[PDB]
Design a protein around this motif. Structure first.
Motif, mmCIF file in Angstrom:
data_model
loop_
_atom_site.group_PDB
_atom_site.id
_atom_site.type_symbol
_atom_site.label_atom_id
_atom_site.label_comp_id
_atom_site.label_asym_id
_atom_site.label_seq_id
_atom_site.Cartn_x
_atom_site.Cartn_y
_atom_site.Cartn_z
ATOM 1 N N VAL A 108 0.862 -1.164 0.000
ATOM 2 C CA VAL A 108 0.000 0.000 0.000
ATOM 3 C C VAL A 108 0.905 1.223 0.000
ATOM 4 C CG1 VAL A 108 -1.874 1.208 1.199
ATOM 5 C CG2 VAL A 108 -1.721 -1.293 1.332
ATOM 6 N N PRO A 109 1.104 1.889 -1.161
ATOM 7 C CA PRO A 109 1.932 3.104 -1.160
ATOM 8 C C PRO A 109 1.249 4.190 -0.339
ATOM 9 C CG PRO A 109 1.593 2.239 -3.416
ATOM 10 C CD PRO A 109 0.577 1.587 -2.510
ATOM 11 N N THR A 110 1.930 4.701 0.699
ATOM 12 C CA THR A 110 1.363 5.721 1.585
ATOM 13 C C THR A 110 2.496 6.529 2.215
ATOM 14 O OG1 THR A 110 0.099 6.049 3.635
ATOM 15 C CG2 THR A 110 1.120 3.909 3.362
ATOM 16 N N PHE B 130 -0.366 -4.095 -5.647
ATOM 17 C CA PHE B 130 -0.238 -2.699 -5.261
ATOM 18 C C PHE B 130 -1.605 -2.063 -5.175
ATOM 19 C CE2 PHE B 130 4.305 -1.999 -5.223
ATOM 20 C CZ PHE B 130 4.768 -3.099 -5.887
ATOM 21 N N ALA B 131 -2.010 -1.645 -3.957
ATOM 22 C CA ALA B 131 -3.299 -1.009 -3.751
ATOM 23 C C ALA B 131 -3.097 0.498 -3.783
ATOM 24 C CB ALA B 131 -3.900 -1.453 -2.410
ATOM 25 N N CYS B 132 -3.381 1.130 -4.932
ATOM 26 C CA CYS B 132 -3.166 2.564 -5.108
ATOM 27 C C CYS B 132 -4.310 3.403 -4.653
ATOM 28 C CB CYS B 132 -2.780 2.890 -6.546
ATOM 29 S SG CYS B 132 -1.373 1.935 -7.159
ATOM 30 N N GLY B 133 -4.053 4.211 -3.631
ATOM 31 C CA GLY B 133 -5.040 5.109 -3.064
ATOM 32 C C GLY B 133 -4.964 6.502 -3.629
ATOM 33 N N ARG B 134 -6.036 7.242 -3.464
ATOM 34 C CA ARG B 134 -6.236 8.636 -3.893
ATOM 35 C C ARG B 134 -6.949 9.372 -2.742
ATOM 36 N NH1 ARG B 134 -4.068 11.327 -8.657
ATOM 37 N NH2 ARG B 134 -2.478 9.724 -9.042
ATOM 38 N N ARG C 245 0.163 -11.099 3.770
ATOM 39 C CA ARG C 245 1.136 -10.187 4.336
ATOM 40 C C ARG C 245 0.888 -8.797 3.737
ATOM 41 N NH1 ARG C 245 5.969 -12.379 1.977
ATOM 42 N NH2 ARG C 245 4.419 -13.392 0.624
ATOM 43 N N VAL C 246 0.991 -7.751 4.572
ATOM 44 C CA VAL C 246 0.751 -6.383 4.165
ATOM 45 C C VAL C 246 1.933 -5.495 4.521
ATOM 46 C CG1 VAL C 246 -0.776 -4.377 4.343
ATOM 47 C CG2 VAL C 246 -1.741 -6.707 4.565
ATOM 48 N N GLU C 247 2.314 -4.596 3.593
ATOM 49 C CA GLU C 247 3.363 -3.625 3.819
ATOM 50 C C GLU C 247 2.907 -2.242 3.347
ATOM 51 O OE1 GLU C 247 6.930 -6.822 2.984
ATOM 52 O OE2 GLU C 247 7.492 -4.695 2.823
ATOM 53 N N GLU C 248 2.847 -1.284 4.272
ATOM 54 C CA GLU C 248 2.537 0.090 3.936
ATOM 55 C C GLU C 248 3.913 0.726 3.717
ATOM 56 O OE1 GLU C 248 -0.636 0.173 7.370
ATOM 57 O OE2 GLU C 248 -0.869 1.956 6.112
ATOM 58 N N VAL C 249 4.160 1.249 2.508
ATOM 59 C CA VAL C 249 5.482 1.746 2.124
ATOM 60 C C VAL C 249 5.460 3.162 1.525
ATOM 61 C CG1 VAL C 249 7.434 1.221 0.582
ATOM 62 C CG2 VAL C 249 6.262 -0.640 1.778
ATOM 63 N N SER C 250 6.440 3.999 1.905
ATOM 64 C CA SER C 250 6.610 5.329 1.357
ATOM 65 C C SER C 250 7.880 5.338 0.503
ATOM 66 C CB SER C 250 6.766 6.364 2.464
ATOM 67 O OG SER C 250 7.042 7.653 1.931
ATOM 68 N N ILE C 251 7.804 5.852 -0.732
ATOM 69 C CA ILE C 251 9.003 5.953 -1.572
ATOM 70 C C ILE C 251 9.936 7.107 -1.124
ATOM 71 C CG2 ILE C 251 8.126 4.672 -3.575
ATOM 72 C CD1 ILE C 251 7.782 7.586 -4.958
ATOM 73 N N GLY C 252 9.457 8.000 -0.274
ATOM 74 C CA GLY C 252 10.245 9.121 0.216
ATOM 75 C C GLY C 252 9.421 10.165 0.944
ATOM 76 N N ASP C 253 10.088 11.069 1.643
ATOM 77 C CA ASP C 253 9.442 12.095 2.456
ATOM 78 C C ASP C 253 8.940 13.292 1.680
ATOM 79 O OD1 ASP C 253 9.563 10.672 4.859
ATOM 80 O OD2 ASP C 253 11.692 11.161 5.045
ATOM 81 N N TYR C 254 7.901 13.065 0.887
ATOM 82 C CA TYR C 254 7.220 14.060 0.044
ATOM 83 C C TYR C 254 5.791 13.549 -0.246
ATOM 84 C CZ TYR C 254 9.842 10.819 -2.915
ATOM 85 O OH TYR C 254 10.406 9.677 -3.422
#
Length: 198
Positions: free
Chosen positions: A75-77, A99-103, A120-129
């Motif tokens: 989950v990109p967040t 990949f569960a893409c949120g808006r 298994r679930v992973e909430e992941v950030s590609i960077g601080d923005y």
């Protein structure tokens, strides 16, 4: 072999990515799991706040269809653990990534809590923005993984002299020893100037 599913309200975002059958990349429109006439995926947030939140009942039904006990749900967040090269390498060994893409303000938190009961679930950030949605982050993460399936110093190519700027003499010398020492020197200096914390 690896299957990669991307669920989003903007399927066209994954069009650039879409040669052998090693990876099977599928993109799904989240609205195909809606039941109302408006095909709505969002609603007002509880406890006040701006914007809208993505509804759990739609996401829950989507993941019941697409995911299994062997799926790694990403989950990109912005609140997620940082994405990195060790994660990309770890994920390249997976049989099924979703990949569960949120808006809007993101997906209702109960989607991840419920999904964790059967995968298994992973909430992941590609960077601080902050991005408007998870689609560009899914593209970045997928590209890092696909690259594996198939600070850095400066690079130079012909000509040896260009606009008054010369390629470092050591690179044209042929001296393997001097070249290795120069590469270590330039990488260390660049890391001290740009990433002193690293």
């Amino acid at each position: 072999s690896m299957r990669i599913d991307v669920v989003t309200i903007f399927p066209a975002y994954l069009d650039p990515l879409r040669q052998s059958g090693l990876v099977d990349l599928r993109v799904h429109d989240l609205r195909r799991w809606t039941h109302d006439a408006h095909r709505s995926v969002d609603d007002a947030p509880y406890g006040g706040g701006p914007g809208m939140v993505m509804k759990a009942p739609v996401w829950g039904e989507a993941l019941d269809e697409i995911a299994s006990a062997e799926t790694l749900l990403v989950v990109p967040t912005p609140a997620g653990v940082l994405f990195d090269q060790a994660t990309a390498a770890r994920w390249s060994a997976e049989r099924h990534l979703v990949f569960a893409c949120g808006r809007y303000e993101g997906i209702d938190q109960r989607v991840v809590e419920d999904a964790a009961r059967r995968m298994r679930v992973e909430e992941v950030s590609i960077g601080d923005y902050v991005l408007p949605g998870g689609e560009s982050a899914a593209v970045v993460m997928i590209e890092a993984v696909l690259r594996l399936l198939d600070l850095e110093g400066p690079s130079y190519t012909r000509p040896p002299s260009w606009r008054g700027l010369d390629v470092p003499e050591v690179l044209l010398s042929g001296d393997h020893a001097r070249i290795a020492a120069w590469r270590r020197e330039v990488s260390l200096q660049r890391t001290r100037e740009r990433r002193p914390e690293l």
